[PDB]
Design a protein around this ligand. Structure first.
Ligand SMILES: Nc1ncnc2c1ncn2[C@@H]1O[C@H](COP(=O)(O)OP(=O)(O)O)[C@@H](O)[C@H]1O
Ligand SMILES: Nc1ncnc2c1ncn2[C@@H]1O[C@H](COP(=O)(O)OP(=O)(O)O)[C@@H](O)[C@H]1O
Ligand SMILES: Nc1ncnc2c1ncn2[C@@H]1O[C@H](COP(=O)(O)OP(=O)(O)O)[C@@H](O)[C@H]1O
Ligand SMILES: Nc1ncnc2c1ncn2[C@@H]1O[C@H](COP(=O)(O)OP(=O)(O)O)[C@@H](O)[C@H]1O
Ligand SMILES: [Mg+2]
Ligand SMILES: [Mg+2]
Ligand SMILES: [Mg+2]
Ligand SMILES: [Mg+2]
Lengths: 417, 416, 413, 416
């Protein structure tokens, strides 16, 4: 019959509707195209599906990193540019060249940077204050955040105005200077009266201080330079951007890395009309960053810029806890292509989500009409590592493909200094 | 033949699916009509509104552009929430209007220009300061509107209806000075006498400091959306903006769209009027205070709203579940463009929205089943849509053709 | 016979569906009746109320206008929450009353006109200041009512029952002056002695500053909805307003409707009374403090409420799920006009409301008499009528009857 | 069937597969030395994927963990054991081994100061001393506490007096003003001053530290460092013991030590041959660990192997919160189900669903989807009986847990 070596369930006589499952080789051939393509677990990825983004969901130790490394690699062979959120500088040590850029406050090779370097028009202040101070986890936390951005944008605006665009100065005024002195320095800015006149006003200012005291730190200790992610995006000859950090400092650099990633997100929306552009945004673990203020729009309006986002994810519960259910749903829905690497059996909810995501099919069998999941939650829970279900965006069948561990020579040190 | 599931002997009840061509025949009418994915739209369904739901990159924009186009051929007027001035560069004429604080061709505007009676102050304060996301956020908003309407009312009274002055008093003037300026207005005592009163005033300041900005930097003029709606000879209104400034202009655009919404409710009795409101992405605007009534009482004015939507979770996050449900329920005609497989919930909603049918198959058996499975919606290729017009009509899976339109005008003209 | 699903051999239990004509025969009665979509309504079902649920543009208004009309032919009195004065321009007579602060024909009114005993102050303060949407909003509301009832009580006492004065003291007079004016009232100490006390007073001010406005600008007069209810010779009450001012008049209209609700509970023992309360859109009013009791204890007063409704999600957002459920449950008779397909939840609720039936075929089957999809495919002016009690439902066509405009809808003051 | 509790079947299609105890033992047996889970040799590759042992009180979690620990010691692996009543200590404790217990005479001297090596380490371990708050508001306080803790400790260390006593005095005894004074010069200088909110925040911090610090202060002094210990191969095993009646009192201290191990392993140098086990008898009895998650996800390089006991899923939920607890559980690839109480059908359902369903073909042919293990089957398990489901593509098996006897080669507690 049908559904053998392809469909895990009982073979069937006729397929009616729903999700189609096909053999690995059959998909590879089916999705193969004329132009140069990149590969997902050895499956050539449909060109049109690239800017629709890819979400790679999988339990810890199943191959998300292998998969993303292979994707990045084949992308480089095609000569595409990319920004890689790279933990421990792994990708850097493998594909990093000399013309490439490194952003890491603790690596000797890092460029010098400050969010000031991205300001070009007045609307840019709030725009990037949104990157420095990501969205709050809760409504109340976001209210504080907003106060923090008000304080940040007005204080930075003035410092820049009087010719001293210093993060050190910015940090001093917003978190060290006494309450009165700050209010004084604010006189003349839109924040002049907003932060005064009532207890509420003072409370709000106090909230702002705390927020900025939490976010700014790593921004301040960042080696200075005139590097601009915006300019870098415009320079074709510019290389690839590697955002690296050592795992033990992950929580410390969370707000800085979340800022850089967000900067790339809003910034691509300003790049000039250029069809030939192809920019990949590799995010190893979407849930480990903060609630990004621009990721959503980037995933929705980045087609013109040729933005291609690929993000790894372990539990759907993570993204939920970071963005919130409603918001997280929208975020996920923005990634048209999906890859399921099989999760843990101690987490049946995710296995169910992934199973449901893969979809059901209506089939005609012998002895008749049946609706069933093409991939059972249990099937996903039993997947061996380095094995994945690939479901490209649009009207294409999914397939269970083996992920091969390709070896890459270390053509550069991961960390220096 | 057109039903994706197993063929059946007899149809009993529920949603009925028909072939693209068969629906086109069915919905075809004598009078001039507009088209939805190449399907002539029933005249009576136009003022019942249309909701176009679809994943990013599936064709919502193509569909809305085609609708707008055929609408223009019929000579109808329209207000288009137009991103990057795309629609503007294609169908924009010289008699047409442009609202964009950064485009040189923009008209000059201030919400003052819409005030005609006393009840109009709160009415449009409701537009300048949209509804709060949360109950607490709305409470602040209300304080903001109180502060806004009373301060503007006085400014207008003393003959200085300036947004600059309004912005100065409500966000720059010291607390005391403001209280002073308020003396004589209904807001005189409301914002004084206790900590709570002061807190409320502080809340109002913040809100207005968030909304007003783009209103202030807006080029001044005497253009009035109200007057414009009344002038038959007036053209079409194009609300444009550059994507990178979307978040910055969110509160301003949300104001203009809302202004159109309440304002049509005052237009004089005119059956021949046909006004379309094209909203590319309903969830990208703020919680509109008047959208609901407009979608419910705009029939007399001949209001026809068409809105794009990606995830139902968005609208929910903006208006709130209960409220978003009511909003969606106000759009009688639906179009489903197929979403992502990473979001099975929406696919389920869309599937359920398209409905089930009870059928008799093969002696015989009775079966209830979704006419379109969630999976079927998740597998739709781009530019393919299910069209389900309001009322008792079958749905159909139709191909969306990408029509080409000559750029008869620049999308943006840097205002210097 | 007449059902949408597969025909069956035998009916076992559950909701039973019948043909339009068959129901018309079944519900027809000896006495004069009113009609619901051309179906004579059982007399006993009248005071059990009717809820007409239906998508925008399906015929709720047509249906209510017909009901009102046949009700007038029978000579019943009624209060009509009438948008744009549509019902007024059609069935409005000269002996009839009009309440609209902006219409020249409006009577003069103030809630003072309803006060007759001491318990009436809070009673109508509950009408002027409807229930809060959220618990916190209601807490403020309560402070507002305290401030409202005590200030009004004193103004009436010293002989100056003025809404203008009431509004001045409660929202314009400085904090201290107000406290001063309160001295002697129960509100004397309640609003003083701590920050909390002061905060509460501030809350009250805001609330009244939101509700009172339209009450103040209302043309003064001595008209009393209470008295009007008692006067048999009184006409019908038309509560009208222009749609563009709907949000502005929301709190005032909500007050009048509520006043009618509590007031009917005081009318004297009169079996022959028949008073209809037509509410075009129940969800467009505020959370009415007395609607519930009216729908439950209005029989002896002969109260008959008919309300229109679009989405169940609306009522929920206004009264809250639990409360909204109780409200809806109070309407024994239901009419379903078919909704939009973009809202499958309501279609499901309406389908479930219409009920299932157990039937014998071919063989035992339980199924919805009306599928959610069937309700989503109803063409306009088509409705399912399910009268209260043990009666079958029926799918009936709603005819658009034409009514001559025997009076202007609005007459600018 | 002999392995499957339900009706025997003709053919297996997909899903979870169940096999006999002996058959799994054969299947998972490997060439190298392995450790055992209820007598079943554990796949080497599954070790660093962690193991979650769920089971009702009195079913065998402790027996199972003791056996695992034992066979692990025979292979010569190092381990950190959260050991109640020093049970594991009295059985496998040697002389080269370490003991952390403020009330045991054999304890090493410790202070979190001993773990600081770089500047980013202050917050890093402040996160260990002050675990995550149960609720969002509780965590906000906690964060203030960490700010106060890290800045005060940083200064104390700076001026040469890294004393927990001094730290505790300044943060919870010194008058408000004096503290603010001592803070002058630190990042916390202005943060905790200038408004009521600021003062409120400081008050919150005080309370938090006053709750956590206590046991840290009364801890015998020393220069022992869990970080250094991890680096010393010749170091022994770490036994974290405490007497049950003092469990609640030592909760925040034990939670700090376990967390310290969690972040610290992330700094250990590149060493493939390392094998470090983290035995946590009851995961829900600790606080919301700030580093457990990363440890369970990035500890492979370090060779971290975590084994945790758990009674009700409702516990973990109450501690970490549903979303977070789900992620936590999901990080343990291998599962062991010891059967719970019938008074708790929810957990039995979760465990049943976790074990998974299978699609099978049976002779009346018929296709059936069913749970391999019914909730009722789990509720009827006799003690010392467990379902073993190793990570990856391996069948589960119902195996008997044997109570092995271990000689008491050392006293469990030695009062000080
Ligand atoms: N350089 C390598 N050599 C051998 N196996 C590797 C290598 N990198 C990754 N793997 C395999 O991939 C598995 C999962 O780790 P990884 O691929 O990084 O994905 P994850 O994102 O789930 O951590 C490892 O358990 C191992 O089997
Ligand atoms: N001018 C065009 N040229 C080619 N393809 C187009 C054009 N406009 C739209 N499309 C097609 O329509 C798809 C959907 O994008 P769009 O029409 O903007 O709708 P959506 O609102 O879903 O983003 C694009 O991926 C592309 O394939
Ligand atoms: N006087 C009329 N002339 C023509 N059509 C009318 C008239 N009144 C009502 N209708 C019809 O009735 C439908 C319902 O409008 P209405 O009766 O106001 O109810 P509702 O708006 O509550 O659904 C319209 O779709 C139209 O088909
Ligand atoms: N030293 C022992 N001697 C006899 N039985 C024991 C011993 N230790 C454990 N057991 C058995 O194991 C059961 C479960 O207790 P335990 O192994 O501590 O697990 P848990 O408390 O985690 O469920 C006991 O009821 C007993 O039957
Ligand atoms: Mg990884
Ligand atoms: Mg679009
Ligand atoms: Mg109506
Ligand atoms: Mg135990």
């Amino acid at each position: 019959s049908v559904g053998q070596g392809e469909f895990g369930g009982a073979p069937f006589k006729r397929f009616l509707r729903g999700t189609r499952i096909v053999s690995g080789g059959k998909l590879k051939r089916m999705t193969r195209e004329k132009a140069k393509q990149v590969t997902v677990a050895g499956v050539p990825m449909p060109r049109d599906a690239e800017p629709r983004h890819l979400l790679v969901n999988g339990a810890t130790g199943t191959g998300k990193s292998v998969l993303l490394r292979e994707l990045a690699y084949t992308g480089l062979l095609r000569g595409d540019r990319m920004v890689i959120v790279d933990p421990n500088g792994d990708m850097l040590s493998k594909f990093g060249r000399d013309k490439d850029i490194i952003l890491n406050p603790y690596d000797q090779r890092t460029k010098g940077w400050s969010f000031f370097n991205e300001i070009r028009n007045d609307y840019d202040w709030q725009r990037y204050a949104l990157s420095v101070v990501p969205r709050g986890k809760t409504d109340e936390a976001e209210e504080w955040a907003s106060y923090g951005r008000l304080l940040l944008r007005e204080t930075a605006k003035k410092l820049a105005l009087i010719g001293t665009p210093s993060m050190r100065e910015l940090f001093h005024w917003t978190t060290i200077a006494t309450f009165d002195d700050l209010r004084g320095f604010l006189e003349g800015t839109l924040a002049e009266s907003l932060f005064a006149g009532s207890n509420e006003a003072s409370k709000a200012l106090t909230s702002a201080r705390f927020v900025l005291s939490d976010k700014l730190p790593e921004h301040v200790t960042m080696p200075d330079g005139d590097f601009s992610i915006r300019s870098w995006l415009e320079d074709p000859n510019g290389g690839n951007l590697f955002i690296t950090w050592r795992e033990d400092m992950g929580p410390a650099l969370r707000p800085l890395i979340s800022a850089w990633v967000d900067v790339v997100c809003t910034s691509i929306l300003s790049l000039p009309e250029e069809p030939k552009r192809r920019l990949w945004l590799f995010i190893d673990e979407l849930a480990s960053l903060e609630k990004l203020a621009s990721l959503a729009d980037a995933l929705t309006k980045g087609r013109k810029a040729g933005l291609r986002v690929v993000a790894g994810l372990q539990s759907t519960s993570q993204l939920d806890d970071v963005y919130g259910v409603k918001e997280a749903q929208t975020l996920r829905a923005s990634f048209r292509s999906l890859v399921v690497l099989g999760g843990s059996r101690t987490d049946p909810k995710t296995n169910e989500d992934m199973s449901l995501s893969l979809g059901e099919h209506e089939v005609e069998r012998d002895r008749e009409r049946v609706r069933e999941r093409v991939v059972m939650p249990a099937e996903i829970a039993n997947l061996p590592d380095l094995t994945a279900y690939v479901g490209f965006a649009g009207n294409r069948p999914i397939a269970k493909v083996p992920l091969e561990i390709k070896q890459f020579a270390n053509r550069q040190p991961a960390f220096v200094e």
